[PDB]
């Protein structure tokens, strides 16, 4: 699994430091093992349409 360039979030999503929002808070989070397994479940569900 490949993550995008972090600078994309830096210049657009956290452009100003004095303002806080939901996306800003979820920007600084690290997944655990169970969340990685959930992402794998997402992808397996996507690979079979019906």
């Amino acid at each position: 699994y490949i993550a995008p360039n972090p600078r994309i979030s830096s210049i657009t999503l956290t452009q100003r430091i004095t303002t806080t929002g939901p996306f800003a808070i979820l920007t600084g989070s690290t997944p655990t093992a169970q969340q990685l397994n959930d992402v794998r479940k997402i992808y397996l569900a996507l690979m079979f349409p019906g």
Binding site: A24, I25, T27, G28, S29, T30
Partner: peptide
């Protein structure tokens, strides 16, 4: 631990 926004989770126990 790099983002400041992760610290408030620790603050809230």
């Amino acid at each position: 631990l790099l983002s400041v926004f992760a610290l408030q989770e620790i603050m809230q126990k």
